[PDB]
Amino acid sequence: SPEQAMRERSELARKGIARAKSVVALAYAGGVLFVAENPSRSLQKISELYDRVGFAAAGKFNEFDNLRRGGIQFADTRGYAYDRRDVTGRQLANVYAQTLGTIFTEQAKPYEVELCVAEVAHYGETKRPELYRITYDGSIADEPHFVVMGGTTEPIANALKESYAENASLTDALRIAVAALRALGVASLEVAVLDANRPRRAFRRITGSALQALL
Amino acid sequence: SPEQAMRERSELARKGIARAKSVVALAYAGGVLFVAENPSRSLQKISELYDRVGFAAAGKFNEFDNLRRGGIQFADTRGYAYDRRDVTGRQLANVYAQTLGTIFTEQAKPYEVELCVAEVAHYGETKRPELYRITYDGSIADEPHFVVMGGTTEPIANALKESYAENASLTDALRIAVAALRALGVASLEVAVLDANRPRRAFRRITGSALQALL
């Protein structure tokens, strides 16, 4: 029965996605901000994908890190094959959707993962930040303001719904994101930005004492 | 049913891990200390992995020795491909986690093994010893002070919880580790250190009469 296998795989995955920490990504004046609840110091849920494309995930670490690696592979092979400015967040999101659909239908167990691909404009350029959310089945959704992944997404999504403000500075967006995430110190937070002002590589982690000052 | 196979595999493995001798690894002034209860003179449960990275295991000997060999292979291929100081205990731990997860989901029988990867700083350098525990499913945990593997881990873990002291000398840490392990002579103990003071290769076994003097 295709219906029972579809429904059951869906439940399996959605469970393991709610069975994990929470990540948020939101647009602010200087680009995009990733704020994840992460206790470990070695295992990370936020990553650079390409010059202006960042990546956050929530679920089973070995699998979304498998996807992290695959995406890095893809982006670099394209950038070298054509050029750096040809790789876009949109292509990456689409590849993740195809791959999560194929995994969801063909592999034994579906990837209990939820992805968010983020993109900002190039240096000295003007364009709105783009957020995409890719779910375990292959579905892809275009988000204008913020993405919330993993755990219980309702209270965080609503708190962000009340607190969000376009063109908020880095500190305000950090306060809003940590507040809505609580609905945690520098020893339990993974914070990075897609700073639109950097010349080439936009991704930049905010850790330690600098993070301490910001929050 | 994914749930019944997951739970059953979990029980199978955890049984065979409790169905084995006990190993402890703890931080002391000169680095890290491995103390295992091992009667054989040929079969070993503690090993050098790379210049500053050591390895202890508990479970089924052929399997954790399979992992021992795989890890040696990995570390040397990296060190030659890039450089010696690029291979870190963190990479090794991560590879073991990926491999034990893949084995746990794809092979017929899960590896009834429990791993501990240890790392110390380089010569003339300063940095705290890092201990990681990798379990049969792929889970990885960052330990600040000591790891206990195999058999009944509760009494040993508690005895160490009362006796542990940071910056204990080699003899004190050996007494604490043997005492907590009892909760055995040189003919039933496998003892080695990751001596942070060695110039390059930090791993060093303590056997025979030298071990006799230390304990």
């Binding site: 393991g16 069975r19 994990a20 920490k21 992460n38 470990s40 295992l43 849920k45 929530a58 679920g59 089973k60 670490f61 070995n62 979304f64 | 997951m6 986690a97 997860g101 746990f104 989901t105 379990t135 499913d137 792929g138 889970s139 990885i140």
Partner: peptide, 5 residues
């Protein structure tokens, strides 16, 4: 299983 983040 395990390795959830």
């Amino acid at each position: 299983t395990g390795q959830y983040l």
